[PDB]
Design a binder for this molecule. Sequence first.
Ligand SMILES: *[B]([O])([O])[C]([C]C1=[C][C]=[C]C([C][C])=[C]1)[N]C(=O)[C]([C]C1=[C][C]=[C][C]=[C]1)[N]C(=O)C1=N[C]=[C]N=[C]1
Lengths: 230, 196, 203, 214, 204, 241, 213, 227, 236
Amino acid sequence: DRGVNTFSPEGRLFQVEYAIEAIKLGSTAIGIQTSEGVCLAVEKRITSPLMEPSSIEKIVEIDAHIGCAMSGLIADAKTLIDKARVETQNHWFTYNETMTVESVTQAVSNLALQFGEEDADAMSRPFGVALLFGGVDEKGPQLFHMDPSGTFVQCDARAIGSASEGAQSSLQEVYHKSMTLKEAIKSSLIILKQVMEEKLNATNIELATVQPGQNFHMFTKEELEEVIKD
Amino acid sequence: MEYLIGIQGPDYVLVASDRVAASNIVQMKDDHDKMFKMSEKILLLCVGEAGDTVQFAEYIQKNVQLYKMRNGYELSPTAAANFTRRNLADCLRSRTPYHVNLLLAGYDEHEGPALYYMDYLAALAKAPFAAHGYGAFLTLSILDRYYTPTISRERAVELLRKCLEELQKRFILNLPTFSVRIIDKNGIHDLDNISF
Amino acid sequence: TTTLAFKFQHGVIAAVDSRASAGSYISALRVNKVIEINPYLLGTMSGCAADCQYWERLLAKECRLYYLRNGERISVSAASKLLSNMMCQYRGMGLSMGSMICGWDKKGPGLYYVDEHGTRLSGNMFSTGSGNTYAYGVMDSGYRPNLSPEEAYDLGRRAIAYATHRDSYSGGVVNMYHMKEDGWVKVESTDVSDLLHQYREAN
Amino acid sequence: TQNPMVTGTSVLGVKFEGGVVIAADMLGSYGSLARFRNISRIMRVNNSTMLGASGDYADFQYLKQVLGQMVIDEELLGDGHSYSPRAIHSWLTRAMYSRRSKMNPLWNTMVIGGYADGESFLGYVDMLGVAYEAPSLATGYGAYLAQPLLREVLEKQPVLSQTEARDLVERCMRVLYYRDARSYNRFQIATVTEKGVEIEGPLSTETNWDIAHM
Amino acid sequence: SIMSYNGGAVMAMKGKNCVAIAADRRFGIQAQMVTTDFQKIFPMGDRLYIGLAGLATDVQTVAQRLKFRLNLYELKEGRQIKPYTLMSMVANLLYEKRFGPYYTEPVIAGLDPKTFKPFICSLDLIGCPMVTDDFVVSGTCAEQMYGMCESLWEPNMDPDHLFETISQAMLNAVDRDAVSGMGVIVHIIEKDKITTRTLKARMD
Amino acid sequence: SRRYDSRTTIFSPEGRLYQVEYAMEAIGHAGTCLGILANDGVLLAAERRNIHKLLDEVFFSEKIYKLNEDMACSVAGITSDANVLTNELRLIAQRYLLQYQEPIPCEQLVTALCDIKQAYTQFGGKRPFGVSLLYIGWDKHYGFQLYQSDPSGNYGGWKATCIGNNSAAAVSMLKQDYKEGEMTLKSALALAIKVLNKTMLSAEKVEIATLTRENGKTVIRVLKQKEVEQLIKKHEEEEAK
Amino acid sequence: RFSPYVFNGGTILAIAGEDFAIVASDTRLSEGFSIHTRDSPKCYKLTDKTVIGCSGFHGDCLTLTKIIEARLKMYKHSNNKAMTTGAIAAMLSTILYSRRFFPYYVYNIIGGLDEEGKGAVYSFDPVGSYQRDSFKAGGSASAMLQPLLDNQVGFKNMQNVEHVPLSLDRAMRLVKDVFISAAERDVYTGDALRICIVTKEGIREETVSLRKD
Amino acid sequence: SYDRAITVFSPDGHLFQVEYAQEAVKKGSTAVGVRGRDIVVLGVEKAKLQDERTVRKICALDDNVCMAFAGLTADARIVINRARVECQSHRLTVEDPVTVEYITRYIASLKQRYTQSNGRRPFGISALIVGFDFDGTPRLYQTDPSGTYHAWKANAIGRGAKSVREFLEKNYTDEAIETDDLTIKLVIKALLEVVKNIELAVMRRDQSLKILNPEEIEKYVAEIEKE
Amino acid sequence: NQYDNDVTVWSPQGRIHQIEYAMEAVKQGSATVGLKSKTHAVLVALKRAQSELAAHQKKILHVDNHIGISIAGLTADARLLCNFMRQECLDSRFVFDRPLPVSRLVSLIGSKTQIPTQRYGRRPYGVGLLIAGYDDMGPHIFQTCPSANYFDCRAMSIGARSQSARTYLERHMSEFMECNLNELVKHGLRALRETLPAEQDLTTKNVSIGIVGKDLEFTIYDDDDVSPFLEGLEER
Ligand SMILES: *[B]([O])([O])[C]([C]C1=[C][C]=[C]C([C][C])=[C]1)[N]C(=O)[C]([C]C1=[C][C]=[C][C]=[C]1)[N]C(=O)C1=N[C]=[C]N=[C]1
């Protein structure tokens, strides 16, 4: 055995390397940042008709102007989502204002290499999750990616999960910086339909759009049906 | 300042409490309930300092409820009175003592009706009848005079009315209405409020 | 201070005074003594100004955090119970705060009186502050559960107005809110001496 | 220290053209008793700064220990950086305020004199963390007797020579010896210039008692 | 005084081959009487009893915390406790609270496991053991009790003589104490039996 | 440090807790110990392993422990581990009594110790307690009761059960001769000896105890060697006939 | 018994205008009947659009000032932007209430620009209650200047009067005249008036003189 | 204190201690939960010398919510008791009875924490949490050693969960939901596919948790053979 | 084999393999260059993009008004070290009301990062920094590593292909002290571009600059703010 804080001969912590591999097992999710707002879409990956599709919440609201897409170990993500919601409200309390998308992404990111055995108070291992933070602030619509290494970057378009390689390839061929939010939603749905084993439907996937003056919105089944129609 | 009364019969316990929630010189509420059901056959009537009372009574309630969930059966009025005492007496020498004066009424399937008196100091006494507050000074002697251990519930209700009528005639505090309840083999029964 | 709130046929009326004082000096002629926690939940303030502002802003933060966690608004009973538990933790610390948690939830209109002692009362009529007795007198006299929204606005307006007249620690303006089924509406922010002068000139 | 034991009276200070001069009697009093008539109440902090202290002597000695070590600590590095008089004044303000906030004050009122980069420095710090800079300072009873004489001269002539400043301080010590019932005719004059800190002592001001024959 | 908030009195007396323990039955707060049947003497063994006067919460608390330690002791030891050893158990329990004590002054009355030698003692509120060969008193009427005991007590009293003596010393003492009374209970502890009696006492 | 760690609180590839399973093996090597519930009482019958001629026999028992006024227990496993657990059982029973001023109901005392045993399987990095217990008792809720708990912190109520050596054979033997609801302390004591005879018979090699209700008070009594001898010869006679 | 507080006096005042905010103070520092220094201005620059006036116990003034200074740097590092006037006000309330049981004996008046470029004034009590104001006075002569601000700047008690909003020139003249009256009647106010003007262009400082006694 | 990382990532991205905890769930007795309109039912499969009362796997958490489990029984007791405490601690803090989602989210959070904190191994249990909310809405949730949770129309956990899930997927119809006795019959029929070997309890909206007696169970078992 | 696992284990060669493995993190981060003149300290770094759609990661961060840094390695450890530096700087201005002398800050980093190299279950920092500062001793360029050792530098380069950049800094070393700001920054850009592939050049998207000196507080130039400096580059 070796410690959770052991470096590989290449300069990377073995536990962080393996946590990234866990994300390759999670549901595929896409985010697209547009001048008119950020779009978030995720496959639920339902395994039984008996399972309530509403009980799978892979797109969450952090605050009115920020949303989050997750992949990997769904239970590890629930802890970081709560840490993000608490953060925004402690900032609202102290400073009477909203946080930037980057500030929230950075706050969640600080908890990444906060794991260990000896000399600790007390996480044993990293979080096996990847997050996409899509929201709007004074800098306009912003979309951020974060992985178990605590590395966060700003993205025009990003895909995470099992079919990350393929979905990003498709995103690259269709993304333009001037693309409308209507075209952003369509591309994400077409790319999501392509990568999933099961057929796409209004009760099979989740879609959320954050636009200035409209706030964070989670698309209804009736809204998802109208989008899938086109 | 508040009023609690209990009269225990051969097979029941009758209890009453004022309905005033007061602050300073104003009567903020006329319909305030001071009894807390702990079990199906146990009531905790609690009087005292501003916050202390709801805080203490509800902590005991939730723990008596946790016992029911944990074990499948409820605490007896005796075990519930002694558990109330252990917590109050344990806070006595602590930074946060509770200024609560309470009465615990209840009916046990094996031991029958029981009425307990507890000091704010957490002295526990089993009494055939009891009263808390300044009103107890004007009514304990009425109860001494007419109370008998074979007192029927209909007769105890009449004896209770005489104690409450005495508070209207001589008590300087305006205690207009009172909550009335009987605990028996079939549980807690809400009776009509004694009003003036 | 003089805060008042009363349930009636058309919802809950909540009116506050606007005076802050330091001894006999008036530190602020107009201060907002109502925290708008959300479109359906308000809080009135009386007592120590810092305690009122900080503690009610802490309830608001916890209410907002509840909505993010559950996707539903907090109930009036949970928000009032939350505030009294905060007060309870600081028992004997010298906090001074009198508030009424007014709102509308799955169980209709809600009005609770919460105190620095941890008092938590549900009721259909309360009044807090150094001028509460004057407000109770006027309010009690003209209150009927079947009051028009405009008739209730006069009862709440006059109750605060007469309390600023007799209570030296009350004055400024009346800030009045009407709690309806689909949220509150700030009715008015009216100068109390202008009201008192209007009532004097009507004699 | 909630109750001081051996205390020092006024500490004087005035900046001149090219440095600062600070003065203090060498007395430690136990109430009215002149118990120690030959203790130094002035300290050379480093080459640019000097501190004089009023109030409790055991607390002054403690600060002299803490400061003295900080200087030694710095000098081991030898990195071309040293505490300016202003930095010692800033540290000492934080030190007094911190102890005051724990309800355990260091019972002192001090005067810090300095000379760094051609600039004269004179700063006051008391047991509560009240700090400020001034062209002249006088602690204790000196704020009532000596500060009016320092300010009177500095009103006529704001820039004083090292000699004028020195004679003004000797005139102030003579007044303090006559009027302060907790003073002694034994004192020190410390001066900080381009050359560095120079503490002189024991000094005494000549007294005139011809008014006895009036 | 804290000890006078509840009132009450407790007493123990030696006999030739028997021991007696008595207490009043009032439970009252200040000048108001609450109940007339408050228990102040608790069995600790077959022939061993402890009586507690003072603050009613601490009378109940000390008796309960003492019964906890006693039960554990008899389980580990496999024997009923000796009277002297119970005194040392109470002294240690009370002394643990030396700088914030329980407001109770115990009195112990029992018979040595040699099924004979009577034992009486008392402890102050901070657990100072005091064994006597005659009587021990504790209460708001300790001055009255000492007067009655000093005058009435005789050395080798028969159980019947012991009963009349401890009964008369309790009744006459608590009849001069405003906050003691409402009846008297007496236990006569012999090798063969325990006799418990409630006396016909004043009710004011 | 990581090198020397035994990893006592971790799952094996099939979802097994190996230290817990190895603790049970220890109990199989301990002396046979059986419990039988009856209508008029409940009993404990255990094999004595301290059976040497030069032993003093100072205590009233070897494996039987009084816990409460209404409860007793017997052990099978590491005796020093069993001393810890029985002492803790006595403290839990007194903490309940101090608080409620009523004796702890039987099942509650068993669950409380089982929560300590379970904690040794989930955290701390310590080995578990190598003991299984058989508890006998009386309470105002379920009357005469018989429990069993193993090193895992798992427990159960029984009408007859066995732990220790040849436990399996004794449970199959008790399964055949146990007449649910029609059992009395007299017939159950006959069954206790009948079982121990096959799973092992001097009164020096056996140790019996009974829990009964006399005058509204519980009576716990370890039977004398002569009493046990009379019970063994009453069975020795029936076996020959 | 040792008292951790002392009253060092001084007056602060702020006015919020259409496109400006003035924060002003005297330069006197005292204790008892003594003057510590005559050059102790109570204005502290926090950002290029936020100034603060602090008055009361000087030990607490110096400390709360260094804490505010440190917290802004911390916020800039964390958010890669300067704190707005509103965020500094909201934060100061939490810092002041962090000492609810051992207060900072400081009267604070923040003055600067809001996110629309308009004048913003936030006034506080030692324990952290605050509000946005059109104008406010604090410190030793607070009660002398506040009624005149209410009258001349708020137009109170004046019927048939044209409500002309104050200009920077007119407000500067009023600050200079109120500190002259404060220095005439309040023993703790004097020596000089330090005025901070906040506009889109930044901060300017002006120093007019007051009575030396 | 024992600060050893027990649950860590394996090179292929697995949390081996959680998968071993799932293997322990798979070995437990079969627990089935079917959500209806007016009643939510829970059923568990079942020695002759053992006391049935002391080995029940359906537990009342509060008055408005209850749960069933599969896996390590001693582990389950610790979770069931920590949930019972949290139900009352929630009534003390907001004076509002716990929603069936709240306590499920609570149990799930507790479970997740044991997969990410030092010195502890995960809980070797899965749970089926049923109950009616304050607005009378019927709920059925499911937790697992990893900490994940979801709602279900019907679900099964333990020894033979795959075959009972396959039966419930093909047999959960609106017709079976229609009668309250038809919802009860679905649970018994689903358990009969694996199995005095059934334990059955029902929670009808405002009424208490009713644990059906063996004769009452046999009343429904007789009609199953007839149909 | 066995001497790889923990930082407390010395190999039979008198080496600590965990420290050496942590240094491999620095060599794998993208190139950064720091250099100084008589009045200024410059940080020039290459920003990698994780895809065309993703942005170029922030390689240069603010520490105080007189100190700025450029990172190479574990970005989470770089944030940890940045906040320690920012805080140590805050403490010095709070206590002394003067900037923390740059060499003193660097000693605290060496003292702080050595602690986990000698404690079981602990690991070194997987971050290497280039520190740009200005104080009473003029401008400074410092280098810190996952081994708690630190260096006072005239110029320096850490990261992927940093050997190529080091060679340019050594050859042009003599010109740096008398350099003006435009020329000193251009020297930094040329060393940075030597690491870059033959097919790749500098860009107003992948270039990041940080400048601190005699009159300038630490300032970070990133995209169009970087353009004036790149407008002087002329070859290879
Ligand atoms: B009221 O008189 O109770 C009023 C309540 C108040 C004041 C300001 C702000 C709010 C909510 C944001 C509420 N309280 C005061 O006027 C108190 C004095 C008081 C207290 C109790 C009874 C009568 C009067 N004043 C202050 O707390 C205060 N005054 C000046 C500066 N800071 C605080």
